Amino acid sequence: AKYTEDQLTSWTKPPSDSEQTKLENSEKMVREAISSDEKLSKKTIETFGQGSYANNTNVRLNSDIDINVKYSDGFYFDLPKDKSREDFGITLTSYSYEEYKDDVENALVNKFGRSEVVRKDKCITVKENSYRVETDVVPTWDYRRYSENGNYVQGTKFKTDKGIWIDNYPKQHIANGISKNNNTARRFKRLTRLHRKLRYKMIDDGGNVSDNITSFLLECLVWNVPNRIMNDYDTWTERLKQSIIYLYNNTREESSCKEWGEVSELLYLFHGGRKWTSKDVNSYMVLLWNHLEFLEH
Ligand SMILES: O=c1ccn([C@@H]2O[C@H](COP(=O)(O)OP(=O)(O)OP(=O)(O)O)[C@@H](O)[C@H]2O)c(=O)[nH]1
Ligand SMILES: O=c1ccn([C@@H]2O[C@H](COP(=O)(O)OP(=O)(O)OP(=O)(O)O)[C@@H](O)[C@H]2O)c(=O)[nH]1
Ligand SMILES: [Mg+2]
């Protein structure tokens, strides 16, 4: 074992006792930037956390906090092929996502100053000082995806500066992660923290980790590890070993994992459009296993 049980147990832990405080401070500052803007305050816009601080899975002290700002006065939607869009109800509006993101960047500059705000491809970064963590503000619009039965699932949708349209389901993501954490006696998110920290260590001491293995991907993988592997073992060394074994085994053939979804369970994990592959995950599991140096016979 390249690492001891104490070290792994320590790395299953939040990087500060004030994580929720930082998240709520970022949420409040973004919400105030919204509410004290002349243009946006007159629009239905919900400010809420997403990502590692909202899932209590962050492992890097004062890493970026993700704050979604979701416009909901008009929603994008997607219908099955056997349904008409006209029959559902159409709405035309002079407002667009591009103008919304420009407005959000304007409000952020107004509240925090242009030198503190940095527009990026998928977000708008507010720089960290001594009182606030660096915050990625993510402007999105309401999004509905309808199924055959008439029910819809609700989420967020946005357009990158490079013109790519992205759909997300952050609320269902957080809800499902909370459910699994409850049903694992709070071991799911500890194992997620351990995996994230291990990825960072491997990248730091020189290891060759693929850029396709993201933190969101690691979280979705640990999400896909069945609860029994977390519940039915007694040390973190063994839970980690078994989770790696499971992910490796079920990523050797695309058939074993082509049905896995992300934490929201509303999008597939390996159905194209992703920057990773199941072979990428399998290679990463091999690299991590060889890094950990478990005892063998
Ligand atoms: O590919 C993606 C990436 C991101 N997202 C959505 O954007 C949220 C934050 O996107 P992040 O890339 O920041 O993931 P993370 O916060 O969990 O890990 P860090 O790198 O920040 O440490 C994610 O929680 C997810 O809801 C997706 O839906 N798909
Ligand atoms: O699908 C996504 C992706 C990203 N995000 C949010 O935008 C932030 C940007 O984080 P990313 O790392 O995913 O985008 P990038 O512009 O840095 O491109 P790469 O070179 O890293 O591949 C993320 O931290 C997340 O909060 C989403 O909300 N949804
Ligand atoms: Mg994040």
Swiss-Prot record:
The organism of origin for this protein: Cecembia lonarensis (strain CCUG 58316 / KCTC 22772 / LW9)
Enzyme Commission identifier(s): 2.7.7.-
Site label Important for uracil base recognition in acceptor pocket, positions: 168
Stretches of the chain forming a coiled coil according to its record: none
Annotated region described as Disordered, given as residue ranges: 1-27
Molecular functions (GO terms): metal ion binding; nucleotide binding; nucleotidyltransferase activity
Cited function: Cyclic nucleotide synthase (second messenger synthase) of a CBASS antivirus system. CBASS (cyclic oligonucleotide-based antiphage signaling system) provides immunity against bacteriophage. The CD-NTase protein synthesizes cyclic nucleotides in response to infection; these serve as specific second messenger signals. The signals activate a diverse range of effectors, leading to bacterial cell death and thus abortive phage infection. A type I-B(UU) CBASS system.
InterPro entries: NT_2-5OAS_ClassI-CCAase (IPR006116), NT_sf (IPR043519)
Highest taxon above the source species: Bacteria
Gene3D superfamilies: Beta Polymerase, domain 2
Ranges of Polar residues composition bias in the record: 6-18
Gene: cdnE
Name under which the protein is recorded: Cyclic dipyrimidine nucleotide synthase CdnE
Named cofactor requirement(s): Mg(2+)
Binding site for UTP donor: 52, 196, 216
Entry's free-text remark on domains: The (R/Q)xW motif controls pyrimidine nucleotide specificity in the donor pocket, while conserved Asn-168 is important for recognition of uracil in the acceptor pocket.
Residues noted as binding UTP acceptor in the record, renumbered to the chain: 50, 122, 168, 275
Cofactor notes: Binds 2 Mg(2+) ions per subunit; only 1 is seen in the crystal structures.
Cystine residue pairs: none
Gene Ontology biological process: defense response to virus; nucleotide metabolic process
Annotated catalysed reactions: 2 UTP = c-di-UMP + 2 diphosphate; UTP + CTP = cyclic CMP-UMP + 2 diphosphate
Motif (Pyrimidine specificity motif (R/Q)xW in donor pocket): 274-276
Annotated binding of Mg(2+), by residue: 66
Similarity field: Belongs to the CD-NTase family. E02 subfamily.
Subunit-structure text: Monomer.
Keyword DNA repair: no
